[PDB]
Design a protein around this ligand. Structure first.
Ligand SMILES: [Zn+2]
Length: 377
C-alpha cells in the first residue's frame, strides 16, 4: 500500500521484533517467572518445554524474538499536541534495522550533532537561573545544528527536564526507555499497530514503574523479554549513540562523522559508568554545576588542582551531594566510584563544567561548543 502509515506498519511488522520468555521458571515467589512476568502472561510453550528441562533460567537462552506488537503513533491527549512515534524493539535489534527505522520509516532528518542527555532518573529540582540557561542553550544548539536530542524518555528526572525545555521548529527528542517498566503500556499493544495509541499518564498508580515523557517526539521501547528491571535499555542506548557517531554523514564520504556530546545533570553512580564509557568512546561530556548529586561531585573535583583530588575529598563530596543515598553506599562501592571519578578526571580534554557566572552570562550552548572544540582539538 501507498499510505505512509501502512507502509510503516508493514515494514515494522516484517522487520522489528519483540522478545518473549519461552521458559517459565519461578524465582522464589509463586506465580512470577524469573523474567518478571506472571505465569498467566506466558505463552503455553513456555510451560515446561522439554528443551530446557532442569536448566537455570537465562535471559540470553530462554527468550525468543517474534514480530513486535506495539508500534505506531502515540497521543498524550493534550490539546493541539502533535502525536509522537514509538516502537517496541528487541534489545538485540540490529544497527541496520535501527538506522532504517529512524531514517526511512520515521523519516528522521539526519543531524549535524547528537546531544545525548543523561543523569538523574528520579525527579530533582533545578534552580530557575540554571534551568533557563539549560533550556536556552539546549534549544539554541539543537535548532542551529539540526541536532537530535537523545534521552531515557520517561517522565521523570533529567528526561522530564529535557521535555520541559523543548516544550516550546521540529526539534527531534528521542527517548530510549525500557519497555518492561512502562506504566499503562497496555494501550500501545496491537498486532497491526496503533494510529494513534491513546497513552494516559496516571503518575498516580505507576508504583515503581515509569510513564513515557509527553514532550518527546520518538520512542524506542527496548525489550529484552523481562519486566520490572531497570537498566534493560542501557546497551542499545549506547549502541544507538555509537551508530549515529559512525554515521559518516559529515559532508561527503571522506572521513567526517556526526559528533556526539553528552550533557549530564544530577546523576547517580550509574551515570558514572555511563560517563566513563562515553569518554572512552571519545564523546565529550558537559556537567552542569549546581544540578545536584554526581554532576556536582564532578564539578567540584574538576575545579581543584589534580593532586588534591583525594579519596577523602571525594568521600566528602559524596556525603555532601548524596544526602539521602550515601548511608546506603558500601565501602567497596565508594572505592569503585572514587577510582572511576579519578579515571574520568584523567581525560580533561573530554570534560567540561558549565558554571553560572552572571558577570559573563553564557547559556549552556557555549559550553557545548567548547566541549566539541576541546575534544576535536
Ligand atoms: Zn518468564
Amino acid at each position: 500500500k501507498l499510505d505512509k502509515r501502512c507502509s510503516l506498519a508493514s515494514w515494522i511488522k516484517e522487520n522489528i521484533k519483540k522478545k518473549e520468555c519461552c521458559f517459565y521458571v519461578e524465582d522464589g515467589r509463586e506465580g512470577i517467572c524469573k523474567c518478571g512476568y506472571p505465569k498467566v502472561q506466558h505463552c503455553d510453550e513456555a510451560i515446561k518445554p522439554e528443551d530446557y528441562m532442569g536448566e537455570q533460567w537465562d535471559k540470553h537462552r530462554h527468550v525468543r524474538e517474534t514480530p513486535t506488537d506495539a508500534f505506531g503513533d502515540i497521543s498524550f491527549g493534550g490539546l493541539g499536541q502533535k502525536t509522537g512515534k514509538y516502537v517496541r524493539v528487541s534489545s538485540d535489534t540490529s544497527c541496520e534495522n535501527l538506522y532504517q527505522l529512524m531514517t526511512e520509516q520515521w523519516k528522521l532528518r539526519s543531524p549535524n550533532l547528537l546531544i545525548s542527555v543523561t543523569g538523574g532518573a528520579k525527579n530533582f529540582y533545578i534552580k530557575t537561573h540554571l534551568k533557563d540557561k539549560f533550556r536556552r542553550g539546549l534549544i539554541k544548539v539543537a535548532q542551529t545544528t539540526g541536532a537530535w536530542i537523545l534521552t531515557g524518555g520517561t517522565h521523570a528526572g533529567v528526561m522530564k527536564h529535557v521535555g520541559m525545555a523543548v516544550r516550546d521548529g521540529q526539534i527531534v527528542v528521542i527517548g530510549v526507555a525500557p519497555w518492561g517498566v512502562i506504566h499503562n503500556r497496555s494501550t500501545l499493544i496491537h498486532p497491526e499497530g496503533r494510529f494513534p495509541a491513546y497513552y494516559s499518564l496516571d503518575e498516580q498508580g505507576q508504583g515503581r514503574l515509569s510513564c513515557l515523557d509527553i514532550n518527546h517526539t520518538h520512542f524506542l521501547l527496548v525489550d529484552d523479554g523481562t519486566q520490572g528491571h531497570y537498566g534493560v535499555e542501557i546497551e542499545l542506548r549506547a549502541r544507538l549513540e555509537k551508530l549515529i557517531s559512525k554515521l559518516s554523514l559529515g559532508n561527503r564520504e571522506s572521513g567526517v562523522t556526526i559528533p556526539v556530546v553528552c550533557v549530564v545533570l544530577d546523576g547517580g553512580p550509574g551515570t558514572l559508568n555511563t560517563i566513563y564509557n562515553s569518554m572512552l568512546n571519545h564523546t565529550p561530556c558537559v556537567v552542569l554545576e549546581g544540578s545536584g548529586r554526581l554532576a556536582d561531585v564532578i564539578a567540584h573535583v574538576a575545579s581543584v588542582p589534580v593532586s588534591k583530588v583525594t579519596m577523602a575529598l571525594i568521600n566528602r563530596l559524596l556525603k555532601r551531594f548524596f544526602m539521602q543515598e550515601y548511608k546506603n553506599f558500601t565501602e567497596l562501592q565508594i572505592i569503585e566510584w572514587t577510582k572511576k571519578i579519578q579515571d574520568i578526571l584523567r581525560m580533561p580534554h573530554l570534560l567540561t563544567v558549565f558554571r553560572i557566572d552572571e558577570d559573563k552570562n553564557y547559556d549552556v550552548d557555549v559550553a557545548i561548543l567548547q566541549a566539541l572544540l576541546k575534544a576535536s582539538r
